[PDB]
Every structure is written in C-alpha cells, then in structure tokens.
Design a protein around this ligand. Structure first.
Ligand code: HEM
Ligand SMILES: [Ca+2]
Ligand SMILES: [Ca+2]
Length: 349
C-alpha cells in the first residue's frame, strides 16, 4: 500500500488522494442522514451497526470447516434480508435501508461506508474521541451465520468467549467497547415504548453509563419483565441484563468502575477499540488511513463535573462491586429526581 499525500479540492490535506472523495460522502450524510450533524437516533443506529457488521466473524467456526463470517465486510447491508432477520440484529434493517442509497450514489463499498458513518456519528456527540477511518473493505460475498452477535440475556461467560473468539479481545476490552451505550437508546426490548436511553445523557459521550449501571435498580421504566431487561435506577432509563451483570462480575467490575470520573481513559480506550472493531476480518497493513476526513470531535459544553450522580441519588445507592478501589465520591445534581427523555426513532425501528 503506497500512500500519496494530497491536497483535496476543498483545500484540506489528507494522507492519500483516494480519501478526497470521502469529503463529498461526509457532507451528504451530515445533512441527509444525521440531520445537520446531530448525535440523535440515526447517529446512534449507525454506531450500533458497526458492531453488528464487525463482530460476525468466527475463527473457531472456520477451524471446524464452516464459514464463520467476514467481520467488517458490509455483509449486514449487502445481505440485509438474511442478517437483519437474526434476533440479535432486531431493528437494524431501518438504519440499513436509510444508509443504502448513500452507498449506491457514492460508489463506495458497503463495509467502508458502515465504518465511515459510525465514525462520523460519534464525532457528532460531544465528548467523543477523535475518531479514525481506514478504507479497504471488499464487499462481502457470503452473509454471516447467526449466533455470532451477543444478546442482552447471554451470560457474562458467553459474551467474554464470543468476543475472545471474534477478535482475541479480553475481558477488559469488552468493557471498553460497551462505552458506546453512553450514546444509545433501546427501541425493541420493551414493546410498549421505543427510545429508552441507557444513560441520562444519550447525546453526550461520557461515563454516565458506567455510573448509572452501578446504582441499585428499583423499577422498570415501562412494562416489567421483558426478556434481557432488568430494573433500572431512574424513570425513563432502561437497563439490560448483560450490562448489569458485567458491571458486577469480579472479572470486569473494577474496569467498569475505572471510567467513572476518568474522561481521558474513557476516550483513549474507546478510540482504540472502535478502530479494532472496524478492522475485524481485514489486514490493517493493507488499508488506507483516511482519518483526516473525519471531523474534529467537540468538548462537552457547560461547566458541570464530568461525572456526577443524577439528582436524587447518592453514594448510598451504588452497589459497590470493585474490591480494589472504592467508588468515587461524586457530586449529586440538585433537585428532584427527573425522568430521562426518550429518543423516538424513525419509522420501522
Ligand atoms: C457486547 C455485548 C452487547 C450487547 C448484549 C448489546 C445489547 C444492546 C441492546 C439489547 C440494544 C438495544 C437494541 C434494540 O432495542 O434494538 C443495544 C443498543 C445499542 N448498542 Fe449495544 N450491545 C452490546 C455491545 C455493543 C457495542 C460493542 C457497541 C458499539 C458500537 C454497541 C452499540 C450500541 C448502540 C449505539 C446502541 C443504541 C441503538 C440506538 O440508539 O438505536 N453495543 N445494545
Ligand atoms: Ca459482517
Ligand atoms: Ca452518555
């Protein structure tokens, strides 16, 4: 891979002349997919899509003589009819259908487009790392098998083993990639209400997800007892069983707690693991670095502390699970407990 540093027609310099075409893709999706650069529903869905495209790869299966999926190869978009019907991928055909036209129009590979839209999406959320974007994913030729994407009702062991198989990720890295639930909502677990967020700041990439999953769950936000859902600590917020148990397991509880009040570790770890996900099934040395096309991320506005307890909660409500270090003493926002507002998805989610 020979790279040719170049100045694009917009006047910006990039690592390789082939990267210049992505500035037109960027302007199109910022206006027509993310409604003016928002960290809203489509941005969240695009971030989710990166993981469901990428994690569908299995060296264990390949060792048994069976196709195990191609990783970040755009298969979930190319074969959407097959893959979006898998239960772990519930609700993803909506975002795939919204993304499809941009791929056809710009003549980029589905896989590179999914990794691009995920990185741009995150750049729209205040607090996000400065994201990378590498090109080079050839179109998938076979859909991924089912049973590769984790479900919210899988055990901690099941999920640890799944991500270890897919990309040799350890239990620490599992925790890091779950940071993406800091900018996310749930549309399909509670059938009575769509758009319940995982943390109280679904438009900000912060550590509230790690704080709020550690509080005692006291109620369901909509209907009770749905598969993969557990009680949450705040009105309007949802908690799934996998996140709840990873936060409390002796292998991963101290790593989960380490992001509380530690913005630089959150950002650095997530930057790293997001890039790794987007390279599953690929040879990093055969890819082109087009990270200079991705916009600069913005800081979190205002002057509140980086991490805090939501109003109405104090250290007494934390279920301490990390045996090595006490949960940090955070401030509590003033006033009455307030409900987290839902994020309505586009039709079909
Ligand atoms: C490792 C185990 C994981 C489990 C069990 C899991 C589970 C879930 C579930 C149940 C939902 C709601 C889906 C729906 O209602 O249709 C969700 C949403 C989401 N997940 Fe995960 N997830 C996992 C890891 C990840 C990772 C590594 C990423 C990073 C890209 C991610 C990104 C997201 C995002 C951004 C959303 C919000 C979607 C939206 O707002 O429409 N998740 N996750
Ligand atoms: Ca795939
Ligand atoms: Ca957040």
């Amino acid at each position: 891979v020979i790279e040719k540093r170049a100045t694009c027609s917009n006047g910006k310099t990039v690592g390789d002349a082939s990267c210049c075409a992505w500035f037109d893709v960027l302007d199109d999706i910022q206006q027509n997919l993310f409604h003016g650069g928002q960290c809203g529903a489509e941005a969240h869905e695009s971030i989710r899509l990166v993981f469901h495209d990428s994690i569908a790869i299995s060296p264990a299966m390949e060792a048994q003589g069976k196709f195990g999926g191609g990783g970040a190869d755009g298969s979930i978009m190319i074969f959407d009819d097959i893959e979006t019907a898998f239960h772990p991928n519930i609700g993803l055909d909506e975002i795939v259908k919204l993304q499809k036209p941009f791929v056809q129009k710009h003549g980029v590979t589905p896989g590179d487009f999914i990794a691009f839209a995920g990185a741009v999406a995150l750049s729209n959320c205040p607090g996000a790392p400065q994201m990378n974007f590498f090109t080079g994913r050839a179109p998938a030729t076979q859909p991924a098998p089912d049973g590769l994407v984790p479900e919210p009702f899988h055990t901690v062991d099941q999920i640890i083993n799944r991500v270890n198989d897919a990309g040799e990720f350890d239990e620490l890295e599992l925790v890091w990639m779950l940071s993406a639930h800091s900018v996310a909502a749930v549309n399909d677990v509670d059938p009575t209400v769509q758009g319940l967020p995982f943390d109280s700041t679904p438009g900000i990439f912060d550590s509230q997800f790690f704080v709020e999953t550690q509080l005692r769950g006291t109620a369901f936000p909509g209907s009770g007892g749905n598969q993969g859902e557990v009680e949450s600590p705040l009105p309007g917020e949802i908690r799934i069983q996998s996140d709840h148990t990873i936060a409390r397991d002796s292998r991963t509880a101290c790593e989960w707690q380490s992001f509380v009040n530690n913005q630089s570790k959150l950002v650095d770890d997530f930057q790293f693991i997001f890039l790794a996900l987007t390279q599953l099934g690929q040879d990093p040395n055969a890819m082109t670095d087009c990270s200079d096309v991705i916009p600069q991320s913005k800081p979190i506005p205002g002057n509140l502390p980086f991490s805090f307890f939501p109003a109405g909660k104090t250290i007494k409500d934390v279920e301490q699970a990390c045996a090595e270090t006490p949960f940090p003493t955070l401030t509590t926002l003033p006033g009455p407990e307030t409900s987290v507002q839902r994020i309505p998805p586009p039709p079909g989610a």
